Nucleic acid binder design. Structure first.
Lengths: 65, 430, 32
RNA sequence: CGUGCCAAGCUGCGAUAAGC
RNA sequence: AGCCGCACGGAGGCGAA
RNA sequence: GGGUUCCUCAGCACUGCUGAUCAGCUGAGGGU
């Protein structure tokens, strides 16, 4: 029984989410671009350093293993 | 009364009320970043140069690296935080932080546990057969180093947290993923090459470039999602205008939250295998390294290289499973830690000056009403995204990429709020 | 704030870390 | 009496409103 | 080759169409 | 007849036969 209730309710709340939604802002080539640009940038920035450290430090572990 | 004695014994970091220049917060952060790589690279002192593959599931979230001085990484700290949110979350240990007591209680306490979980994980790791040779003597030695390295991070986090920019954890994670990418794709045994070479060799291997694509796609997707937002707040309109909204929950709301959901699963695949080759199959039958049956199995993220269709049901469960945990964490974080009332209102209204009126009652109500979308959704969604981000699968981690990208942007913001606060020595709250 | 009866200046943790590195960095590698 | 993103006075203008 | 009256703000906009 | 003096919020340089955290006062919104 209760199960039916809750099921009836979620359907309601979820519908309450409606009147709330219908808003989201799709990104514009301009904004989207600029952003995704900084993201990848920082990503590679955090990646490189790990490389500079890793790669070689393994050339060692490896040539002395 | 509380565990205040040993709690007062646990060192902390000296926070200077002096002038900490942007240039210094920056330079500081950087020093932490590097010491991170050093450890993440250095291997743990252990004669058994032979280690049983790796746990392609814990690293990412735990942004660490098995076999190195940081083989446990942020893992403990996260675990710890997970429990707290669990207790102080399901009311089990109801606490109204408000007072600097509960606040500093919840904290100090968790910190300790972090050191507890620091060793536990260590032992659990070796006990899960993360290295192969259980020489009671050698085993002991290892555990030492292991958990002690993670300790350094706990304190390096503290440093960044009070001497630089952004956050240790946040950083650290982004630190790892970024590297995992730049190296995996371009490093020594780099993929871009393995692919490029495969082209030259004359046998174009779509499996060498694949994972690299996986990452672009994710990044692109994850970013879009990280964009979603509301809008003023005044009109401008476009324009402006004066006053001053006005936000609109989004993705970074359920950040720390999802970090905990994924981390929960992290401690299950670890805790199951651990309590597998060291007892009874409570959680699942691993074999082959990871798990091939049990709670463990149904709760193991599918990513790595390519998406696995050959197990629909497996997908479904995971997804739904991840969603539940996500929502749970999100709630235990708002009970909690989500846009409060005091501070909110207290500050709010401002833009004192013709442009022309202001605000007042009713506004708060409306906001709260049209604000119950985040928390639940924010996470429910994210968690979904994160998960699906894994089916697709990508370098560094389908779910990890989501955090990184976010952490990196919240880290850009940090760099700006700073570039400015470095001018008007006062508005350190607007 | 913190109930940590003890105060530790970052310069230390950093140097203490440079410690872990040197120790194991040589404790392991540079065999013999 | 209106008209400006915010516009009280002055000036301009007139629902095409400091303009077409 | 600037401009958005007196009117030097904030935001935003117009101008080699 | 007055004309916003009404209600709310924020205020105290002005007005209030003293003072004021109050107000028919000052500012912004709202209200028929």
């Amino acid at each position: 029984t209760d199960f039916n209730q809750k099921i009836e309710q979620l359907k309601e709340f979820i519908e309450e989410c409606r009147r709330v939604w219908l808003v989201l802002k799709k990104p514009t080539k301009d904004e989207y671009l600029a952003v995704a640009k900084v993201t990848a940038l920082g990503i590679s920035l955090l990646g490189i350093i790990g490389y500079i450290i890793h790669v070689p430090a393994t050339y060692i572990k490896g040539i002395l293993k | 009364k509380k565990l205040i004695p040993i709690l007062e014994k646990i060192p902390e970091v000296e926070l200077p009320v002096k002038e900490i220049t942007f240039k210094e917060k920056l330079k500081w952060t950087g020093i932490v970043l590097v010491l991170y790589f050093i450890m993440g690279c250095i291997d743990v002192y252990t004669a058994g140069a032979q280690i049983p593959a790796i746990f392609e599931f814990w690293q990412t979230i735990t942004a660490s690296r098995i076999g190195t001085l940081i083989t446990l990484g942020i893992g403990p700290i996260v675990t710890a935080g997970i429990i707290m949110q669990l207790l102080v979350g399901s009311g089990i240990i109801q606490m109204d932080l408000s007072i600097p007591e509960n606040r500093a209680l919840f904290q100090g306490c968790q910190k300790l546990l972090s050191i507890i979980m620091c060793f536990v994980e260590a032992v659990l790791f070796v006990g899960a057969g993360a290295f192969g040779i259980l020489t009671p003597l050698l085993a002991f030695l290892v555990i030492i180093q292991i958990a002690f390295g993670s300790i350094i991070l706990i304190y390096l986090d503290e440093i960044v947290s009070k001497y630089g920019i952004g956050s240790g954890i946040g950083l650290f994670i982004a630190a790892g993923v970024s590297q995992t990418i730049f190296v995996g794709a371009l490093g020594p045994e780099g993929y871009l090459w393995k692919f490029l070479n495969s082209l030259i060799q004359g046998v174009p291997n779509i499996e060498y470039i694949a994972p690299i694509i996986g990452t672009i796609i994710v990044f692109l997707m994850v970013v879009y999602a990280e964009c979603m937002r509301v809008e003023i707040p005044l009109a401008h309109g476009r324009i402006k205008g004066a006053v001053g909204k006005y936000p609109i929950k989004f993705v970074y709301v359920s950040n720390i939250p999802v970090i905990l959901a994924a981390a929960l699963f992290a401690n299950i695949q670890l805790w199951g295998l651990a309590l597998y080759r060291m007892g009874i199959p409570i959680l699942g039958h691993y074999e082959g390294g990871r798990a091939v049956d049990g709670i463990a199995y149904y709760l193991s993220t599918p990513y790595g290289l390519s998406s696995v269709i050959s197990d629909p049901i497996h997908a479904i469960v995971y997804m739904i499973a991840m969603i539940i945990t996500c929502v749970m964490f999100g709630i235990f974080w708002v009970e909690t830690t989500g846009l409060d009332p005091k501070s909110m209102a207290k500050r709010i209204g401002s833009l004192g000056m013709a442009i022309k009126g202001f605000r007042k009652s009713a506004i708060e109500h409306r906001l709260k009403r049209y604000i119950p979308p985040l928390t639940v959704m924010s996470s429910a969604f994210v968690g979904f995204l994160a998960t699906i981000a894994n089916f697709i699968g990508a370098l560094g981690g389908g779910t990890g990429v989501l955090l990184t990208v976010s952490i990196v942007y919240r880290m850009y913001e940090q760099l700006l709020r700073e570039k400015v606060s470095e001018l008007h020595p006062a508005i350190a709250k607007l | 704030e913190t109930f940590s009866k003890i105060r530790v200046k970052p310069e230390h943790v950093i140097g203490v870390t440079v410690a872990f590195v040197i120790i194991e960095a040589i404790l392991t590698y540079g065999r013999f």
